Design a protein around this nucleic acid. Structure first.
Lengths: 106, 197, 51, 172, 137, 99
RNA sequence: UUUGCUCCACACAAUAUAGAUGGAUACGAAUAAGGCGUCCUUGUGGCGUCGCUGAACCAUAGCAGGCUAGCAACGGUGCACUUGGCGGAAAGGCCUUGGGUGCUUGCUGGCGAAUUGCAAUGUCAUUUUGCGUGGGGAUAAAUCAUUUGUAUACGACUUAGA
RNA sequence: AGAACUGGCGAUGCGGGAUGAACCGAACGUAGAGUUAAGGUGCCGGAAUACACGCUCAUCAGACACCACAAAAGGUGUUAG
RNA sequence: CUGGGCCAGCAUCAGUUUUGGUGGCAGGAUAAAUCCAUAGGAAUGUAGCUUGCCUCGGUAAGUAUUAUAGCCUGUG
């Protein structure tokens, strides 16, 4: 109980985009340990959270969370696509993100 | 999958190392590259020196001080290859970069910290045998880098220290693998083997 | 108000075209062919395998 | 022009009351699908008989499978082709397990060495070479010697991950 | 010294009877034998026992093993089997670290979560008795 | 109401009889016999919201648990297994692991 | 200038953060060659073994990890002390000796957990900065003005004045 | 500089050709999901440091239509004929 | 404290779509192979045999077409 994590780590790389136009509506996530679209199929539909600090407390907390979910895979190397209730801020390209194991249809 | 990754520059091909190290920064991973002076470039030394001179001719004509800066140190020759592969003028660019350090030799904390290689940028895996190449240290020196010998001196001093260290290590790992031997074949050991351990 | 596709949705599949009911029931989207032995003649194989 | 299959194409001129039953001609054509093969049939027939496919018909088209698709053979290959500055005949040899396998390397080789795309080459003949040492070409003879063995020095293994915690070796 | 000493790289040779381990494809994981050399890049292989179909293969999707057995070149599948068996090839392979690690790694991967837990508990037991040893001599 | 009735057992890891949703669960392959366990009475209205803790709840927990614990014990390290929390270690790949 | 100033402890309010959530786990060197183990003439030596990836190794069970009783070791690990040493490339860290103290899931018991109601906000990190207490500590200068002319367009420079 | 037929630009954004009136793709109400075109997929940058057979080493290599030039003539460089 | 209102999770569907696992059929040289039977061959010639070489273990040439390995071709 050194470890308590029940999510897989991921990184927020980019919005969906062509060379010169981006689409903030979809985000591209690289899930740790996932190298192929075949592997990434496991994570589709799972929930993600981006988790951040703020100065103003809300429900007596300075931690905040943006939720979303993995929607399809992306390209040939396990990258995955994700939509969020809001839209990841963009300063967060490179930030860590958390990919849960539910909804589980193990 | 590590807070900081430390790469041994040795036997690595600049551009391919630069390519991987740059993607690493843009994805959030801190990198420090050491031993930048034993980095290679493919194709023999005369061509690479020649190239560096073509780069030397470029300066702002009216004020050479505002025109391109020609960095001669191996670490910094590498930093140039990298920088060109990152949108270094945007905010996100500067952030990516700030996650990265380059050194000639391997200066302390890193000296007692593990280093990794990057196979897809490793020359011996990459260059076809017979193909001529260039040591970055030798190249720098010839275009004005001052500290080849200083870093050489420091490295041998370091390497002596590292040997002693590695020798204690091995000796210790003897005692362990020895004194293990008894437990190594014990009922618990047979159980672990049943589950692959 | 909504086009339903008989190719998914067996209900409208059955609405247009019954038969489907028997088609499925009898299989026949599978269905073994008879069996004959007829051999090709000499000349057909001579020239298949010619040069 | 791809992963090749070899076809028998058999065709003929359309019947006339004057000549019902006109003569039948066959070609063996290497192509990837049958639409190409019949195209190819007509391309050659038109250069060899007065006929356009508008006056003829294809009577049969049948894939010819390799008889011994795991015996290794040495093939003689005869080829006509266009260079940027003329046109040339050329004999080459290829070692392989099937004509279809041989022909495909013929095409890659004509591309590599002579910059000949497919439109520019005609396969003239392709033939298993019966007796060893009717083999004429060094770079295939080399493989025919008794108790042939060789190493494969300097092995590079592909890595699954970007960093590695050991300096690799090329040892085979 | 006074003999001429020359250490010579002891490469696994591509040769009839050389046994190889197939890296890729559908026969990935299985052993086959080189039957006939095609060129510097291709060979005919055949793995009757592991049920890998006699086929021309590119050497890059195969990995040479140290094992080799007597096999006349060109040998058809039937006599490949007879010979492979006569030679006791699987016996030799199984005995290798190489084959053992593959097996080890395979077994680990099949472990249940409960099983993973037991390995933990057992490890902690072994550890314990080890650290007191590694402390006495 | 589609849910899964869950136990623990309480004495083993402090989880009471409880509703759990099936999409938030991984099913291990490890399995205890549940033959001698009552369980008939438990349903949606059992959990119905009508602070305290009902005496029935506390007694049903003991009824169900005693039998479960009696089964769990016949298999070494099962108790301990269930007392111990699950987590991902560095290295774990959910899409690979067996459970 | 009246408030002061500084280092260490742990204590409250603001504040920021390119993004902790089991461990950045140290030979060097070659790659048409090497690692490791062992022997010795300590070598371009002999014998053995390994690779084919870290899919490793180490750690990991307990109210986010509570309360209580023992057995067996005498180990492990944390903490704050302590005996030696080593580290200047940016050493600011490393190895060591000796006890003390907490924990110990090596093993065997006795309790606890619910109702946070079928997921949602539920582990606290480290930066500054203002204040609060108790201890140790320390007790200046620079600028303007005045002046020199080795200086100077003005600033600037360089001198001198208790 | 001047004609022929058609298609364009002009009157027209959009995706590609770094850039660009006219090339390639494709023409345009406000949006969601999917799929593609032309063009791409080491890194800048979304996408295989993919797979396969060759060829090439340049003390001035080479790297993609329109297109941002190169010839006669030579080489015991190396390849295949 | 209910109710609205809105927001969310799960379930059963409907529309669109994307990505897997699996069953049954058809065709062709009624795939070609492999495998089996048989005829016939050869060489990058297996066993024998011959003769010098031996350390007499083995060996080199030569004979020899299945034998103390095997392969190729036809037909079935």
């Amino acid at each position: 109980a050194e470890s308590h994590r029940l999510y897989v780590k991921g990184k927020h790389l980019s919005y969906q985009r062509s060379k010169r136009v981006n689409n903030p509506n979809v985000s591209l996530i690289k899930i740790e340990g996932v190298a192929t679209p075949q592997d990434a199929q496991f994570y589709l539909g799972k929930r993600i959270a981006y988790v951040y600090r703020a100065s103003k407390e809300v429900r007596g907390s300075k931690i905040r969370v943006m939720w979303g979910k993995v929607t399809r895979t992306h390209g040939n190397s396990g990258v995955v696509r994700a939509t969020f209730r809001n839209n990841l801020p963009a300063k967060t390209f490179g930030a860590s993100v958390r990919i849960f194991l539910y909804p589980s249809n193990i | 999958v590590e807070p900081v990754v430390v790469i041994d520059g040795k036997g690595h091909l600049v551009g391919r190392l630069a390519s991987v190290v740059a993607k690493q920064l843009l994805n959030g991973q801190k990198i420090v590259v050491v031993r930048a002076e034993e980095l290679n470039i493919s194709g023999e030394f005369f061509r690479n020196k020649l190239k560096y001179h073509d780069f030397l001719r470029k300066a702002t004509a009216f004020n050479k001080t505002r025109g391109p800066f020609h960095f001669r140190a191996p670490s910094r020759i590498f930093y140039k290859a990298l920088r060109g592969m990152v949108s270094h003028k945007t905010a996100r660019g500067k952030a990516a970069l700030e996650r990265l350090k380059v050194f000639e030799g391997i200066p302390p904390p890193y000296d007692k910290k593990k280093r990794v290689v990057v196979p897809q940028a490793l020359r011996v895996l990459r260059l076809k045998p017979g193909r001529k190449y260039t040591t970055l240290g030798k190249l720098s020196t010839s275009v004005g880098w001052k500290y080849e010998d200083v870093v050489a001196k420091l490295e041998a001093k370091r390497k002596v220290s590292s040997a002693e260290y590695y020798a204690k290590k091995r000796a210790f790992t003897k005692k362990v693998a020895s004194a293990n031997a008894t437990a190594a074949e014990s009922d618990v050991a047979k159980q672990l083997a049943a589950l692959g351990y | 108000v909504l086009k339903k596709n008989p190719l998914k949705n067996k209900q409208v599949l059955l609405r247009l075209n019954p038969y489907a009911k028997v088609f499925a029931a009898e299989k026949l989207g599978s269905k073994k062919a008879e069996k004959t032995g007829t051999k090709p003649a000499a000349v057909f194989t001579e020239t298949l395998k010619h040069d | 022009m791809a992963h090749f299959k070899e076809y028998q194409v058999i065709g003929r001129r359309l019947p006339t009351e004057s000549v019902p039953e006109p003569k039948l001609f066959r070609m063996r054509i290497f192509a990837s699908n049958e639409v190409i093969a019949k195209s190819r049939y007509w391309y050659f027939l038109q250069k060899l008989h007065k006929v356009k496919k508008a006056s003829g018909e294809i009577v049969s088209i049948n894939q010819i499978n390799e008889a011994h698709p795991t015996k290794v053979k040495n093939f003689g290959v005869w080829v006509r082709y266009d260079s940027r500055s003329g046109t040339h005949n050329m004999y080459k040899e290829i070692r392989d397990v099937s004509r279809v396998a041989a022909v495909e390397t013929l095409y890659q080789d004509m591309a590599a060495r002579h910059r000949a795309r497919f439109r520019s080459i005609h396969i003239l003949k392709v033939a298993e070479i019966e007796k060893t040492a009717d083999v004429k070409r060094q770079y295939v003879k080399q493989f025919l010697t008794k108790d042939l063995k060789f190493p494969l020095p300097h092995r590079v293994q592909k890595s699954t991950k970007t960093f590695s915690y050991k300096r690799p070796s090329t040892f085979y | 010294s006074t003999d001429s000493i020359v250490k010579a790289s002891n490469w696994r040779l591509v040769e009839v009877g050389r046994v190889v381990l197939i890296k890729k494809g559908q026969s990935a994981g299985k052993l086959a034998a080189i039957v006939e050399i095609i060129d510097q890049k291709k060979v005919l292989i055949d793995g009757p026992k592991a049920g890998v179909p006699r086929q021309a293969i590119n050497l890059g999707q195969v990995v040479l093993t140290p094992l080799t057995f007597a096999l006349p070149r060109g040998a058809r599948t039937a006599t490949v089997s007879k010979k492979w068996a006569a030679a006791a090839v699987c016996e030799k392979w199984a005995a290798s670290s190489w084959a053992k690690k593959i097996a080890q790694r395979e077994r680990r991967a099949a472990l249940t979560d409960f099983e993973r837990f037991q390995v933990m508990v057992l490890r902690k037991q072994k550890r314990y008795t080890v650290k007191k040893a590694l402390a006495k001599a | 109401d589609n849910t899964l009735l869950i136990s623990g057992p309480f004495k083993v890891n402090g989880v009471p009889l409880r509703r759990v949703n099936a999409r938030y669960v991984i099913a291990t392959s490890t399995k205890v016999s549940v033959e001698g366990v009552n369980v008939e009475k438990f349903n949606v209205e059992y959990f119905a919201k009508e602070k305290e803790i009902k005496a029935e709840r506390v007694e049903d927990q003991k009824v169900v648990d005693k039998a479960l614990i009696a089964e769990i014990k016949k298999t070494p390290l099962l108790k301990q297994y269930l007392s111990a929390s699950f987590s991902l270690k560095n290295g774990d790949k959910p899409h690979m692991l067996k459970f």
